[PDB]
From a paper:
GUS contains a deep enzyme active site (the two catalytic glutamates lie ~12 Å below the protein surface). To understand the underlying structural basis, we prepared C6-propyl, -hexyl, and -nonyl UIFGs (2–4, respectively) and resolved the eight X-ray crystal structures of 1–4 bound to EcGUS or Bifidobacterium dentium GUS (BdGUS).
Particularly, C6-nonyl UIFG had 23,300-fold higher potency for EcGUS than for HsGUS (Ki = 4.5 nM for EcGUS vs. 105 μM for HsGUS). The IC50 was as follows: 2, 1.2 μM; 3, 18.6 nM; and 4, 3.69 nM. Furthermore, EcGUS contains a narrower aglycone-binding site than LgGUS and BdGUS. The alkyl substituent of the inhibitors therefore facilitated an increase in hydrophobic contacts with nonpolar residues of loops 3 and 5 in EcGUS, e.g., such as Leu361, Phe365 in loop 3, and Val446, Met447, and Phe448 in loop 5. Interestingly, owing to the longer alkyl chains of 3 and 4, Phe448 rotated outward in EcGUS/3 and EcGUS/4 and thus increased the hydrophobic contact area. This additional hydrophobic interaction might have compensated for the binding energy loss owing to the absence of the water-mediated H-bond network, leading to the observed lower Ki values of 2–4 for EcGUS compared with other GUSs. Similar to the previous trend, the entropy contribution of 3 and 4 increased with the length of alkyl chain (–TΔΔS2–3 = –1.32 kcal mol−1 and –TΔΔS2–4 = −1.34 kcal mol−1 for EcGUS), while the enthalpy contribution decreased (ΔΔH2–3 = +0.04 kcal mol−1 and ΔΔH2–4 = +0.99 kcal mol−1 for EcGUS).
Author numbering:
A (entry chain A): -1 to 77, 80 to 362, 369 to 601
B (entry chain B): 3 to 7, 11 to 195, 199 to 237, 242 to 364, 370 to 600
Write the structure that this text describes.
């Protein structure tokens, strides 16, 4: 449907985000049968929302549990005559909500919010019970996809194809918000600029039988433009347009009035224009250079759960290190991260949860794009995730790119058949932004067959790590050669969205061999040397802020160790190399082929 | 503590600013939006939040600010602003009008803002937080200055001086007849529970249930309340609805209470007339990244670790914990020794200054008063909790200089008169043994901190066993009192191993915790053990702290050392609430 983030005005929120819900497992799938919605928690225990249920009890048998978990919470209802709505900003994978024995709504998104209108079903003044059924399972039509395997005892074991651990549960806000019966439930805003001198910001919104008078107030509450109608444009003059450095943000207050009731919604948008020209990524008609991380929503104890201290601290670290950009790696991030990126002018490459469409990253199906794995319904679900992501992050000026999928195996015939309609559909959904598909390493420029449909070429390369293990002299030649081959092929702006190596924070060696910090430094350094002599490399993005948790494997030593920082946010030796490089260059500009 | 039948203002981010030049109160920064502010998260200590070295140690004035919408549904009700905890000092302003202030730090403070607030429009909230300690703050300290005005704070406890807003901020609403004060005391012989009440223009009607609304008693009055006929295993707790009735509005307040009576008999600690044995940790309000800020995920996880390792009790070490810890504590029925921030009254703990600890320039007058205040507040907030079985006035004070007894006697007297239903204690330091301590008689349970084999007799088990044994049974023969060892632990690097089982290695933590447990087992007066710290925690910079205090069974990110499984074998291998029969 339509997605508007709620905000306090003559509108109200009761943060049911309160922790300490009742939590229980359903190892027998008796919950849907035995009507657990009715009343009690049976044999529950205290859990905390937001937060992943896997790491929260230090029980291994819970963290690998694959099935149905039950959340439970009684709450009181203060808003009368207002539309009361129950919003879940994120319930990872599947969630079915119940308000006092009655199914309200359900979702199969994972990292996208879903809400429901509960005005008839509640009465402001008495209690009410909310029971959530959260499913953490992945089959071939989920985004991301997976394979759940039962064995001889019927015990479910979830296997997937991405790297990060499949943290599940309620990860973001659960809120009970309250809006007048004539609401402003959808908005779209597109901005243009000409020579940083003047241009318009077209408006568009959806009401509940009310008219929309829209004003454009300033950063100090000064009206600069008005407008009367459901559509149309409106022009500023000599704007304070949104730059990657500062990030100026106008406050467009929209009004939807009825003959009796009225609703006012303030929506912050910044004037900026993002486009791709040849091999240049232009923000406000200036060629840009991306620097920063591909991070994860990962932490100790809470898993993929959200928390504010992590936001302010992580943004302080990136702010110190000189990073100006990041990419919401492998799933839509919490909207709060994108609000911060909006105010602080942080350019973001947004991505969907489509990751793992690849069976070469080592009882696996034998054809990746057959009916037994990634079929038409996988394509429908992928288009769904695109729809929801764009419908949530469409107005945020910090998003400059949509990324449909991550590292798909494109060698087999049919990858183009699967991905081309999704490129067409995404271009038809949001024309204001470039589109991309992050490229796997074993699909170099001479075997890929998908990168033509996208505006920006994103690359994940690990020459010298997975291949040429320990060889810098050779990985330099290979890396430079394939980079110039991508240039000779597509003449596109090339952002390296992943490049990193594993490093035991504390492992040193005089020989600068793999897994030591000296190898991380020398490796990133050589990669930077190659980066500086390719004209079409419009951005670099290291593989990963900090070490994150992965599934158990013989390649993951307590998870992925390719982070610049540790899981507790401590810098390895390479963090200060990146400090020197990024903070030493001119902001938003590519190095002049050398310092 | 609020319930209803509110809008939690601690949601999201606040504007944060520093006052290095100390211009805030003079230039009236609360009457405007903070110039040059940055986003900060509440709850959470401001020191660790920005990875800034200069912000972490800053000693002065910090400014929080946040606009909020007051809901329309609270038209004619009193609107109250509650700060569950603002560490050390806080002065709160509501939209150009000064409302409140408090020098507590680890206890809440609330203020009535009904006139200054018009429910429906947005108002701004500005908080001035101070993190300074002199000799009259609890805990005490002293600040020093030089040229360029750089302020540098020095204190006498171990843990790092985290500050800021550490617990939720509430904005609750009650009808014009509210239940401001409640008290409940439970008895049990081989019983019932007197009730209390304070209100304004309202009568008191008290009823109480069990599982769900199943009343099993009642009462109409501010006394008596006795009727029909809470354990450390599960923790059965009844629900006591209090009603305050007026001509127009009515108030209902639910208070969970568990039937229990704690008392000391000879050298036994009796909870419900049964001898007990304390096992568990002396923990801290410390975490990665957020300082002393509260968080539910951490409480759930740490309670999972304590449940797994077999702990049955712990002590809110060196300051009042967040009350959520105590609600959980009486829910799952874990025994809690509650303690004030009174720590650091000692000049002998020197890493290797006034001249006498109980002089006028240090610890005299307002110091004793404000200590009695920290008592009064801790008790006024945690009195009704059945999980609290003990009072702890102070921790590790130097009682050797002249005038210590003259200081500690009145505090014991007043505290005993305030809450006579629970035993009282004072954790004494190691440098004051049985032949030199002069205060352990004023208290019901004697608490001991002992580090034989670490600070003295460093690395020698064969003699530290003898010294610990002699000191222990000499205490027993001296005062014939119940002795809980509230601190015993040694530092340990998480990954350091050593074949020789020498200091700082995990083998030394294992073998050192073991000998202490045998000497514990051959002493009849030891009514419990609490390994020093649950998890490694942050302290001030010293040559004895290797990135904080490493005396934890778990690391800071909650990962177990070799001793965690030893203690999980010891505490769950014995019977719950029972001490081994000398083996
Ligand atoms: C057959 C040739 C294979 C080439 C190597 C492919 C490496 C893919 C790297 C992986 N790319 C995806 C990312 O989520 C992971 O964290 C990253 C990694 O594992 O470090
Ligand atoms: C004879 C006495 C020699 C010196 C003993 C010093 C004992 C001080 C105990 C200290 N008591 C306070 C506690 O927070 C600290 O963690 C603990 C410590 O040492 O780390």
């Amino acid at each position: 449907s339509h997605m508007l983030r709620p905000v306090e005005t003559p509108t109200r929120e009761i943060k049911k985000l309160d922790g300490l819900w009742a939590f229980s497992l359903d190892r027998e799938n008796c919950g849907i049968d035995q009507r657990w919605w009715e009343s009690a928690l049976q044999e529950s225990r205290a859990i905390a929302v937001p937060g992943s249920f896997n790491d929260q009890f230090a029980d291994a048998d819970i963290r690998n549990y694959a099935g149905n978990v039950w959340y439970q919470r009684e709450v009181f209802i203060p808003k009368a005559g207002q539309r009361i709505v129950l919003r879940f900003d994120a319930v990872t994978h599947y969630g079915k909500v119940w308000v006092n024995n009655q199914e309200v709504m359900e979702h199969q998104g994972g990292y996208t919010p879903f809400e429901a209108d509960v005005t008839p079903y509640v009465i402001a003044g008495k209690s009410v019970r909310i029971t959530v059924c959260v499913n953490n399972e992945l089959n071939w039509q989920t985004i991301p996809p997976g394979m759940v395997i039962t064995d001889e005892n019927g015990k479910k074991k979830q296997s997937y194809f991405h790297d990060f651990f499949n943290y599940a549960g309620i990860h973001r806000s659960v809120m009970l918000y309250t809006t007048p019966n004539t609401w402003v439930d959808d908005i779209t805003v597109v901005t243009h600029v000409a020579q940083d001198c003047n241009h318009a910001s077209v408006d568009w919104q959806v009401v509940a039988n009310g008219d929309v008078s829209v004003e454009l107030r300033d950063a100090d509450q000064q009206v600069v433009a008005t407008g009367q109608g459901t559509s149309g444009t409106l022009q500023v003059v000599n704007p304070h347009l949104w730059q990657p450095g500062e990030g100026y943000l106008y406050e467009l207050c929209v009004t939807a009035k009825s003959q009796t009731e009225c609703d006012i919604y303030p929506l912050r948008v910044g004037i900026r224009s993002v486009a791709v020209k040849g091999e240049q990524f232009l923000i406000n008609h200036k060629p840009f250079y991306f620097t920063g991380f591909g991070r994860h929503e990962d932490a100790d104890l809470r898993g993929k759960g959200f928390d504010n201290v992590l936001m302010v601290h992580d943004h302080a670290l990136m702010d110190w290190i000189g990073a100006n950009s990041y990419r919401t790696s492998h799933y839509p991030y919490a909207e709060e991260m994108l609000d911060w990126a909006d105010e602080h002018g942080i350019v973001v490459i947004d991505e969907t949860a489509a990751v793992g469409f690849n069976l070469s990253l080592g009882n696996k199906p034998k054809e990746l794009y057959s009916e037994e794995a990634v079929n038409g319904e996988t394509q429908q679900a992928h288009l769904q995730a695109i729809k929801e992501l764009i419908a949530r992050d469409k107005n945020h000026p910090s998003v400059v790119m949509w990324s449909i999928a991550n590292e798909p195996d494109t060698r087999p015939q049919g990858a183009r058949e699967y991905f081309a309609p999704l490129a067409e559909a995404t271009r038809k959904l949001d024309p204001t932004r470039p589109i991309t598909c992050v490229n796997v390493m074993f699909c170099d420029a001479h075997t890929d067959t998908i990168s033509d449909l996208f505006d920006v070429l994103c690359l994940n390369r690990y020459y010298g790590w997975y291949v040429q293990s320990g060889d810098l002299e050779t990985a330099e030649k290979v890396l430079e050669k394939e980079l110039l081959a991508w240039q000779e092929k597509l003449h596109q702006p090339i952002i390296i969205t992943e490049y990193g190596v594993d490093t035991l924070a504390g492992l040193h060696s005089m020989y600068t061999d793999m897994w030591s910090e000296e190898y991380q430094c020398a490796w990133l350094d050589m990669y930077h040397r190659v980066f500086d002599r390719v004209s079409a490399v419009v951005g670099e993005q290291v593989w990963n802020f900090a070490d994150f948790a992965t599934s158990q494997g013989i390649l993951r030593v307590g998870g992925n160790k390719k982070g610049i920082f540790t899981r507790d946010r401590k810098p390895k030796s390479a963090a200060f190399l990146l400090q020197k490089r990024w903070t030493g260059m001119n902001f938003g500009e590519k190095p002049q082929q050398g310092g």
